[PDB]
């Protein structure tokens, strides 16, 4: 998958989540979060960000 | 000097009212030049309303930012009116409140009080905007 730091071309190794493997529209500001899903969960944990 | 405020639909009408001269300066250009279109009789409106005519009488210098040709012509107007009641003569100027209330008379969305209107969108659930739905007797 993506987490190997040498893809073939520049743009292959895209973005992935840390928590899940999931891919489908992540966040630039926080490289974690499934897609949208842990954005509101980890807001309810502590703090917020835009 | 005597100054005052007066906004509608977002505006900052910084209307100075002063004795001597009677040129209407809007920012850094005269009245006819800033507003060349059709609605610019409104900025000349509360001037002649008080009884006597202007140009001979009182000097007006406004600054204004914020507001379209629909908004600005009321913002400047409202500030000239709100600064009229706060002005000084010899009898003085407080009861011109009632005659600026009698400007747009008997359905009082006047020139003493503001057009408290900020045109934002259209609503969900029935038919809606401002002035409530469904009446035979309207």
């Amino acid at each position: 998958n993506v987490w190997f730091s040498h893809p073939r071309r520049f743009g292959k190794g895209s973005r992935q989540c840390r928590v899940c493997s999931s891919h489908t529209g992540l966040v630039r500001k926080y490289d974690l979060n499934i897609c949208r899903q842990c954005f509101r969960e980890k807001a309810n944990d502590i703090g917020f960000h835009k | 000097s005597v100054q005052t405020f007066g906004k509608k639909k977002s505006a900052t009408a910084v209307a100075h009212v002063k004795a001597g001269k009677g040129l209407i300066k809007v920012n850094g250009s005269p009245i006819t030049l800033v507003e060349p279109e059709i609605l610019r009789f409104k900025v000349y409106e509360p001037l002649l309303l008080v009884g006597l005519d202007k140009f001979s009488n009182i000097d007006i210098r406004v600054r204004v930012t914020g507001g379209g040709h629909v908004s600005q012509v009321y913002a400047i107007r409202q500030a000239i009116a709100k600064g009229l009641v706060a002005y000084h003569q010899k009898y003085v100027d407080e009861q011109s409140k009632n005659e600026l209330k009698k400007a747009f008379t008997s359905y009082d969305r006047t020139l003493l009080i503001a057009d408290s209107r900020r045109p934002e969108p259209k609503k969900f659930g029935g038919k809606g905007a401002r002035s409530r739905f469904q009446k035979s007797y309207r």
Binding site: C35, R36, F39, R40, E41, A43, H49 | -
Partner: protein, 96 residues
């Protein structure tokens, strides 16, 4: 102008540190242009509470109310050094 800026979480820690700079740093040898308020360095947004999935009918408004004060110190003489005495209230992020 020697630009000091303060920013913290809420009001309670902010009042003490702001007033202390007027008391401690300022005296006679310092003239400040003074202790101002300013708008908050806030970031608000309305989004949905459930993050996508079941329920479009759910909402949650958010903010990050991070209350800034500027409080600028004008005269750059001897007394601009004595700010090192106040180190109280962590949670206040001092930035110079």
């Amino acid at each position: 102008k020697i630009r000091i800026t303060l920013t913290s979480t809420k009001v309670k820690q902010l009042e003490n540190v702001s007033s202390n700079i007027v008391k401690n740093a300022e005296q006679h040898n310092l003239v400040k242009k003074g202790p101002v308020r300013l708008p908050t360095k806030v970031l608000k947004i309305s989004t949905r509470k459930t993050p996508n999935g079941e329920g479009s009918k759910t909402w949650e408004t958010y903010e990050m109310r991070i209350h800034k004060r500027y409080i600028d110190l004008e005269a750059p003489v001897q007394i601009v050094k004595r700010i090192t005495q106040i180190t109280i209230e962590p949670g206040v992020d001092v930035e110079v």
